[PDB]
Amino acid sequence: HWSEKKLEEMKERDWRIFKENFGISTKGGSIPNPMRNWEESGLPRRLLDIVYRVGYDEPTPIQRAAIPIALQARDLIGVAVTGSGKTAAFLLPLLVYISEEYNKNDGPYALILAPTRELVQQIESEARKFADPLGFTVVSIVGGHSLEEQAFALRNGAEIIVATPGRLVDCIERRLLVFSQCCYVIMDEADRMIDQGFEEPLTKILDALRQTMMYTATMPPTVEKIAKKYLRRPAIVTIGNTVEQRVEFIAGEDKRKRRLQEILNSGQFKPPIIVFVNIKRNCEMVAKDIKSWGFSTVTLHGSKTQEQREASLAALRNGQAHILVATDLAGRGIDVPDVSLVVNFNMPSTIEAYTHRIGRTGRAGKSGVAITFLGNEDADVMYDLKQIISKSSISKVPEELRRH
Ligand SMILES: Nc1ncnc2c1ncn2[C@@H]1O[C@H](COP(=O)(O)OP(=O)(O)O)[C@@H](O)[C@H]1O
Ligand SMILES: [Mg+2]
């Protein structure tokens, strides 16, 4: 008795289905629910009918996920590949905050940084068809053109200025330009910023002190540092884009708990560690048993809400809790970073769930270890699993799948 996303109030479960469909994920920061449609974007209709006019009938996942949480005074990180639609995703929320605002002030209200001149000019244009109807200007600071034409922003608007970190710094220390009013900064593709040595020049641009946002495809340690030092209360949107090693054991029905004890006491793996189980009663029973082993375990269950469920996942990240027990429902959507080990105490009847639970261990790369317990009571999956292990022939040998 359910309606498949043709509902008015929705349910937390339904929201989770929503995200899983569009593949988007978020790290908790008291986050607002994502957009289904433009008609209540939180944006004014004069901007919406422009969104329609350009032919953007459908929101890209990054747009629907990033915009609603940007409309509130919170910084966001946009982990997404190029072509995601992320440009308009940071443009629209900027435009609505452009006016919350005068002509004569002289010194940009907002700044947009990009690794390449091509991007700076793409952002310029993509912004211009949104800005020109709104009656204000966007200026690109780029070389390779006549300087007189650049110095041409005569009415001295430049409510938004888009430029390379490496050329804007050129006009900054000489103080040929001022950021007295730049209280909104956007960092598109900080990947190739660092990949093209804009690190220190970018850091030079730290003036004024409100929102700052950051769209990338990746977060290497250089990029993560740049993030933490300048992003107050980060909100991390992510979009779904082999890694896993897939060790597998054959065992009796419940000798498996002693093996789990052995693994945990091996110390080979570093908490957080996720151990899945097919049955709820066995979920809470093994969790209590791991509690008796002295380990710090946290249970994520539907009786409580996201406010507390999120608190629990955060309680997993922050090291107050080490091991997590779960049913398939308990954490289909969860995205706890760099978990050392996925223990399938019971392999699920459906095969896609296995792929799903092991599918979340490496962000861009991790230990990716997944031990899966097996028996003859779970024979139906055996023939399938083998070939899927071959599909990820990388990182693992099935070694002993001589039967089905
Ligand atoms: N809401 C939308 N719906 C459909 N197409 C869009 C939307 N927003 C942007 N586009 C188009 O998608 C193309 C991809 O560009 P874009 O995704 O903005 O690059 P990036 O991912 O690097 O920001 C652009 O040419 C743009 O015209
Ligand atoms: Mg885009």
DSSP 337-392: TT-SEEEESS--SSHHHHHHHHTSS-SSS---EEEEEE-GGGHHHHHHHHHHHHHT
Half-sphere exposure at residue 14, Cβ-oriented, CA atoms within 13 angstroms: 13
Residue in the block written with tokens 């799903």: 356
The answer to whether residues 316 and 296 touch, using CB atoms and an 8 Å cutoff, is no
Residue 195, classed as helix, strand or coil, is coil
380/375 Cα distance (integer angstroms): 11
Residues 6+ apart with CB under 8 A from 16: 332, 333
Tokens 């593709």, located at residue: 189
Determine which residue's CA is closest to atom 18 belonging to ligand 1: 85
Residue 321's identity, in one-letter code, is A
- Give distance in angstroms: CA of 82 to centre of ligand 2: 6
Residue of 52, 60, 120 best suited for mutating to test ligand 1, as the one with most atoms within 8 Å of CB: 60
Q: Residues followed by a break in the chain, C–N over 2.5 Å?
A: 100, 209, 241
Helix ranges restricted to H, 158-296 = 165-168, 190-194, 199-204, 221-228, 256-266, 280-292
Burial degree of 98 (CB within 10 A; 0-12, 13-18, 19+)? middle
Comparing C-alpha atoms, which of 65, 130, 60 is closest to residue 94?
130
The sheet that has 160-163: what strands, in order across it? 24-27, 236-239, 77-79, 211-216, 184-188, 110-113, 160-163, 138-141
Tell me the torsion sign for CA atoms 295, 299, 300, 305. Answer: negative
Ligand 1 in reach of 41 Cβ (< 6 A): no
Contact 78, 219 (CB under 8 A): no
Strands 160-163 and 138-141: parallel
User: By the 8 A CB rule, do 279 and 346 touch?
Assistant: yes
Cα-to-centroid distance, 340 and ligand 1 (Å): 36
Domain(s) labelled CATH 3.40.50.300 in the chain stretch across 12-239, 248-392
- Nearest-atom number in ligand 1 for the CA of 56 is 3
Confirm whether residue 58 is marked as ligand binding: yes
Contacts of 117 (CB under 8 A, 6+ apart): 142, 143, 144, 164
HSE, CB side, 13 Å, CA atoms: give it for residue 349: 2
199 conformational bin, left if phi > 0, alpha if psi -120 to 50, beta if neither: alpha
Tell me if the domain spanning 12-239 has CATH number 3.40.50.300: yes
Torsion angle, CA of 223/227/229/234, rounded to 10 degrees? -160
CA of 13 to the centre of ligand 1 (A): 30
- Three-state DSSP class for 243? coil
Residues ≥6 apart with Cβ < 8 Å to 87 = 122, 123, 126, 127, 188
- Rounded Cα–Cα distance for residues 299 and 42 (Å): 35
Cβ pair 113, 105 in contact under 8 A: no
* Residue 34 three-state SS: coil
Could you tell me the resolution of this structure in angstroms? 3.2
Fold entry, domain 248-392: Rossmann fold (3.40.50)
> Could you tell me the end-to-end alpha-carbon distance of the chain, in angstroms, rounded to an integer?
37
Partners of 374 in the β-ladder = 250
Report how far residue 54's alpha carbon sits from residue 128's, in angstroms, rounded to the nearest whole number: 12
Tokens of 115: 């690794």
Question: How was this one solved?
Answer: X-ray
